Design a protein around this ligand. Structure first.
Ligand SMILES: *[C@@H]1O[C@H](COC2O[C@@H](C)[C@@H](O)[C@@H](O)[C@@H]2O)[C@@H](O[C@@H]2O[C@H](CO)[C@@H](O)[C@H](O)[C@H]2NC(C)=O)[C@H](O[C@@H]2O[C@@H](C)[C@@H](O)[C@@H](O)[C@@H]2O)[C@H]1NC(C)=O
Ligand SMILES: *[C@@H]1O[C@H](CO)[C@@H](O[C@@H]2O[C@H](CO)[C@@H](O)[C@H](O)[C@H]2NC(C)=O)[C@H](O)[C@H]1NC(C)=O
Ligand SMILES: *[C@@H]1O[C@H](CO)[C@@H](O[C@@H]2O[C@H](CO)[C@@H](O)[C@H](O)[C@H]2NC(C)=O)[C@H](O)[C@H]1NC(C)=O
Ligand code: NAG
Length: 436
């Protein structure tokens, strides 16, 4: 109606620590076909939200989420609407499905002007992250009109295989993360590069092992690949697509700078309150949340927050709150979205457990302080990947969070979509007014 980007001067939000239950998560109303029955897992979820539109993707598998048989991959876009209540809802306007559900891997969506542009890898050897040597570089673009039009040719849906990929020293590159940004007529997608370990230049003396008893200086370089002797190391970055250029589509890989370097992992870049922000999943020993203002997009340098309160579950080598270099490849993607630049306040869903993917908690937090939070499920509810995007509905900050969750009544793993308004008051309605 009035759903737009988080920009300008939003209505006030609570900026102090409180135990009051001011967060009131709601399951959001949607037309996305993301409900099922038992026997199937809905995995590989993607959510993007932009300028009152959204993009969404998943892979439906028969059986296990990791080992099941690929049933259906969908990429869908739509509008974020007002259901009449000044509450957001998601209406899907355009859905694309490939004939082979198993060959599309690692999609990433960026919005521009009429379309969501979704960049995906194409693989016949499974997950390129797990079959790095076998996978031959193959990327495709699925362009979808957010408002389809009849008798428009390829305006509604356009598929294009991309052959010209500028990757510099890397052998191969691919999208890695849910969503990116536009700057003018150029799109940037979160991405990763595969670089042979033999070409990786790293001084082990840069690996911070002070006050870390059990750490060896080699641990940072060894943990830049999926195991200590991996043929490749992984480096996060961006894939640049300039819509203004004529002809044969060219993508260009832009590696992330080496400040607070960790293994290439699903990331996202987004604009909030006038500037790009980056989140990088912590898939190794540096387990505190990695997010910050993007200093420069190309070359890519992120001013990582010194956040001391949000982490992610791992196993015992790199469990939650680990900070010392170890050789490990583990963790979860749980992003956060800047909603107040002056005080650097963010909103996102974290998993409140040290070594188990469970207990999704929606939190509003600063670098060194969680201000307020609310659980999204009963305790010991298993949950893994979370994607949070925030926006304005008539100048009020709302967030939509995708949570990959075990559904009890419908005994399957699937994404659930929560809408959460950020309140203005630090006390909840009626607090202290109901007697005792
Ligand atoms: C969840 O993990 C916390 C681990 O903190 C620690 O960091 C990891 C990387 C390992 O090196 C652990 O060996 C290390 O303890 C743990 O909390 C910490 O607890 C220690 C004492 O046990 C305390 O000195 C730290 O300040 C504290 N840190 C934080 C950020 O809380 C959790 O333990 C729970 O919370 C503690 C405060 C204390 O009540 C513990 O008894 C309690 O179990 C741990 N949670 C669980 C449920 O294991
Ligand atoms: C890496 O690629 C190889 C080659 O495609 C995969 O091996 C195939 O695995 C399927 C599934 O079990 C078998 O049906 C084929 O017979 C295998 N082909 C060959 C040539 O061995 C392997 O599974 C892939 N690894 C991962 C982790 O996806
Ligand atoms: C995207 O491509 C356009 C060209 O199509 C770039 O715009 C040009 O920049 C050069 C400077 O090297 C000028 O000489 C041209 O006149 C510009 N053309 C237009 C139409 O503005 C643009 O800079 C590219 N964007 C990015 C981010 O690389
Ligand atoms: C984080 O701390 C370091 C201190 O070593 C400082 O140089 C850096 O500017 C801090 N980052 C932010 C975003 O404040």
């Amino acid at each position: 109606q009035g759903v737009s980007d988080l920009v300008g001067l939003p209505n006030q939000i609570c900026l102090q620590k409180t135990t009051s239950t001011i967060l009131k998560p709601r399951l959001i109303s949607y037309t996305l076909p993301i409900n099922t029955r038992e026997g199937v897992c809905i995995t590989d979820p993607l959510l993007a939200v932009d300028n009152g539109f959204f993009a969404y993707s998943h892979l439906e598998k028969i059986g296990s989420c990791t080992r099941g048989i690929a049933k259906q991959r969908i990429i869908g876009v739509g509008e974020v609407l007002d259901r009449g209540d000044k509450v957001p809802s998601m209406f899907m306007t355009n859905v694309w499905t490939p004939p082979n559900p198993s060959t599309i891997h690692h999609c990433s969506s960026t919005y521009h002007e009429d379309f969501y542009y979704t960049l995906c890898a194409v693989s016949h050897v499974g997950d390129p992250i797990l079959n790095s040597t076998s996978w031959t570089e193959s990327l495709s673009l699925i362009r979808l009109a957010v408002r389809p039009k009849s008798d428009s040719g390829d305006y509604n849906q356009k598929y294009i295989a991309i052959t010209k990929v500028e990757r510099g020293k890397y052998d191969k590159v691919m999208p890695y993360g849910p969503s990116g940004i536009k700057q003018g007529d150029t799109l940037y997608f979160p991405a990763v590069g595969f670089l042979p370990r033999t070409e990786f230049q790293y001084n082990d003396s840069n690996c911070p092992i002070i006050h870390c008893k059990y750490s060896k200086a080699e641990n940072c370089r060894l943990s830049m690949g999926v195991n200590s002797k991996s043929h490749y190391i992984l480096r996060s970055g961006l894939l640049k697509y300039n819509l203004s250029l004529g002809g044969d589509i060219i993508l260009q890989f832009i590696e992330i700078a080496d400040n607070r370097l960790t293994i290439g992992s699903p990331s996202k870049i987004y604009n909030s309150l006038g500037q790009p922000v980056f989140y990088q999943a912590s898939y190794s020993w540096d387990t505190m949340i990695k997010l910050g203002d993007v200093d420069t997009v190309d070359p890519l340098r992120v001013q990582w927050r010194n956040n001391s309160v949000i982490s992610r579950p791992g196993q015992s080598q790199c469990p939650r709150f680990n900070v010392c270099p170890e050789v490990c490849w583990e963790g979860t993607y749980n992003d956060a979205f800047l909603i107040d630049r002056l005080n650097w306040v963010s909103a996102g869903v974290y998993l409140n457990s040290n070594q188990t993917a469970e207990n999704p908690v929606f939190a509003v937090f600063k670098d060194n302080e969680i201000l307020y939070q609310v659980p999204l499920a009963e305790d010991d509810t298993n949950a893994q990947k979370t994607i949070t995007d925030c926006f304005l509905l008539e100048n009020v900050i709302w967030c939509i969070s995708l949570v990959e969750i075990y559904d009890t009544g419908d005994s399957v793993i699937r994404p659930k979509l929560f809408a959460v308004k950020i309140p203005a008051q630090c006390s909840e309605s009626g607090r202290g007014l109901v007697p005792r």
